[PDB]
Amino acid sequence: NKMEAKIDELINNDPVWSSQNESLISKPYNHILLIVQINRVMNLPKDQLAIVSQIVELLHNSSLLIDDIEDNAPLRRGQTTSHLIFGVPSTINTANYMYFRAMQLVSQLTTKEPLYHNLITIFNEELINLHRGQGLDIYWRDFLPEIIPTQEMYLNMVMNKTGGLFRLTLRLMEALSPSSLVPFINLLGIIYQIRDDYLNLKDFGFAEDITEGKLSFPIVHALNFTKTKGQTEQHNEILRILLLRTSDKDIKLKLIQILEFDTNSLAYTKNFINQLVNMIKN
Amino acid sequence: NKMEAKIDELINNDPVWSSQNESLISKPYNHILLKPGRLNLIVQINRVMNLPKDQLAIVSQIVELLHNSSLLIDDIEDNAPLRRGQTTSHLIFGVPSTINTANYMYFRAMQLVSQLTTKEPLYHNLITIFNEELINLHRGQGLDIYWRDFLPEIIPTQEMYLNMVMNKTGGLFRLTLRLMEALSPSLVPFINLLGIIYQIRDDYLNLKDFQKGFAEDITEGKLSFPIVHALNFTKTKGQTEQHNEILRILLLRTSDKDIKLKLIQILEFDTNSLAYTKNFINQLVNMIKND
Numbered sequence A: 001n002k003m004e005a006k007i008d009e010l011i012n013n014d015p016v017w018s019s020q021n022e023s024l025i026s027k028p029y030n031h032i033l034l035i036v037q038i039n040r041v042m043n044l045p046k047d048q049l050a051i052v053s054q055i056v057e058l059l060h061n062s063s064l065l066i067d068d069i070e071d072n073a074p075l076r077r078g079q080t081t082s083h084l085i086f087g088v089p090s091t092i093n094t095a096n097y098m099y100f101r102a103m104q105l106v107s108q109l110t111t112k113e114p115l116y117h118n119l120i121t122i123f124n125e126e127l128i129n130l131h132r133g134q135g136l137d138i139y140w141r142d143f144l145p146e147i148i149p150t151q152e153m154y155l156n157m158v159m160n161k162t163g164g165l166f167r168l169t170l171r172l173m174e175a176l177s178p179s180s181l182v183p184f185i186n187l188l189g190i191i192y193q194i195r196d197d198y199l200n201l202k203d204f205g206f207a208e209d210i211t212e213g214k215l216s217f218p219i220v221h222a223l224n225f226t227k228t229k230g231q232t233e234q235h236n237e238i239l240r241i242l243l244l245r246t247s248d249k250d251i252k253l254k255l256i257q258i259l260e261f262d263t264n265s266l267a268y269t270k271n272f273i274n275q276l277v278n279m280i281k282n
Numbered sequence B: 001n002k003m004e005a006k007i008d009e010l011i012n013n014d015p016v017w018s019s020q021n022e023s024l025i026s027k028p029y030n031h032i033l034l035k036p037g038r039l040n041l042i043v044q045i046n047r048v049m050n051l052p053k054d055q056l057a058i059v060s061q062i063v064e065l066l067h068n069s070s071l072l073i074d075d076i077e078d079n080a081p082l083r084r085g086q087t088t089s090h091l092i093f094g095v096p097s098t099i100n101t102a103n104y105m106y107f108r109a110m111q112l113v114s115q116l117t118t119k120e121p122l123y124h125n126l127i128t129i130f131n132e133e134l135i136n137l138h139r140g141q142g143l144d145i146y147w148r149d150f151l152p153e154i155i156p157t158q159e160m161y162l163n164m165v166m167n168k169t170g171g172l173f174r175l176t177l178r179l180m181e182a183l184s185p186s187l188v189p190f191i192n193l194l195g196i197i198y199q200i201r202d203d204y205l206n207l208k209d210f211q212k213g214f215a216e217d218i219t220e221g222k223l224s225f226p227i228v229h230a231l232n233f234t235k236t237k238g239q240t241e242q243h244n245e246i247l248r249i250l251l252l253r254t255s256d257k258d259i260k261l262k263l264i265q266i267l268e269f270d271t272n273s274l275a276y277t278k279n280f281i282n283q284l285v286n287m288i289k290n291d
């Protein structure tokens, strides 16, 4: 009787969610928490610009939470990663929750049915590309040495992965522009990712990419260079170190030395970046 | 300048993605499809809804994709060793690929919504429903995981448990119903009640089948309906030792069969949570059938 009235009230109402439940679920996210120039070309009413910014931050910060779980990373922005503090379970769920909260902010960008559809299609396509690229980068790392990607394979993976959020931001803005730079943002994403792989080793930075076993741009060059020159032992030593998932700084340095002195992959990568930067700068 | 050409063809084209690539990253998902898992429920609701078969199939693929992908994530979150009688995908392909693939399929499911219509207004409503219920699904899952992982910081009351279920289990049931109603050329209250019955019966059988199954909810430390009743019952009656012993067992995350059986028998004889739950289920069932 009393129970029934309560069940009645419950099922006839929208699901109950308090501001306090929201805070509990947002903890892994708030922890990591600690465009306008592109707008000098797009000129979006500071209104929409606010939402696009929130969308990008939600996606970007959430994808980093997941990326850190996927790479078992101990640090991010100089502090202990969220999953080590709140646990992997809550961190995955919170990150995924923020993906859908970002998705909901898209509807406040516009109610114009034609443009709305376009915005959700862009959001959908680029999150698809982001995940395809991440899945490929993860697959090569976790199945090593089953597949050693080539430079071309690596660049296609980057166009999907890194290119995704770069293209997402640019395409949303362009579509809302009251006034294509995609080829340019793509080049920019490639530069940013290769430089990120390069600096991970040069700052050595804990050179966490080695510990993670990542097929970075220099590693890909080094593996294909040693394969081509028939340097079996060197090729194998590189694979052996990546497979150790080691945190030993001496071992990480040993690999970096193979890359500096045997395959000259760091100079190779620097050069490649300079040629890309030149394509923009020229 | 030959690199320049390659680079140019690269950046001026859509990202390259092959069917071989698609197959590689689909492994964790394909594995959960190997064993049968709904198409039923959808067809029953269609007696009321009358969706043409070609659209019913698409709603069906959407719910399938989301449900299966949810289970991949759920199993990682509960560190479940088995799903549908087989080794769990994360244990085979690893947590990283599995998280990524499950999340990838959430977006492939979203992409399918546009195979339902070309009418802009209706398209917008379907996406909004999709979006709302995925938000609700994660809100309830967030709470369920939080209570379990930070126990004994929060001991939910029956009411909090029911709101968590309305969000979590209610999410897929309402998503399915709302999409169909929005397509039909409200049974929401009914579907909410069906989901609550479904979840509580699920919590109940996980223990009763062990007292044919592994009472894995105990190994997972879950604040199930019978556990919620027992924790509040022991607190209310001043059964301090049993209240703390229930907490200690959950926190063990144990696979020991005898320890799980001890906890189930505490629910059976000491707190009468199993009988309480069996009756709560019957009463909810009565609210329907008798109407």
Ligand SMILES: CCCCCCCCC(O)(P(=O)(O)O)P(=O)(O)O
Pocket: A063, A064, A066, A067, A071, A130, A131, A134, A161, A162, A193, A196, A197
């Ligand atoms: C589906 C989530 C994909 C997130 C990818 C984010 C890129 C992260 C890196 O920038 P980081 O791990 O050095 O922060 P990447 O070098 O591209 O792996």
Ligand SMILES: CCCCCCCCC(O)(P(=O)(O)O)P(=O)(O)O
Pocket: B036, B037, B038, B041, B067, B071, B083, B084, B172, B173, B176
């Ligand atoms: C309408 C949402 C789906 C309802 C059906 C759920 C079936 C039960 C399982 O989720 P489980 O027995 O592994 O917990 P499935 O694996 O999909 O059969």
Ligand SMILES: CCCCCCCCC(O)(P(=O)(O)O)P(=O)(O)O
Pocket: B070, B071, B073, B074, B137, B138, B141, B168, B169, B199, B202, B203
């Ligand atoms: C945002 C992911 C939500 C996943 C929800 C999965 C519910 C699965 C269960 O049906 P099962 O773990 O017994 O298969 P639940 O009893 O509700 O945990």
Ligand SMILES: [Mg+2]
Pocket: A196, A197
């Ligand atoms: Mg990096």
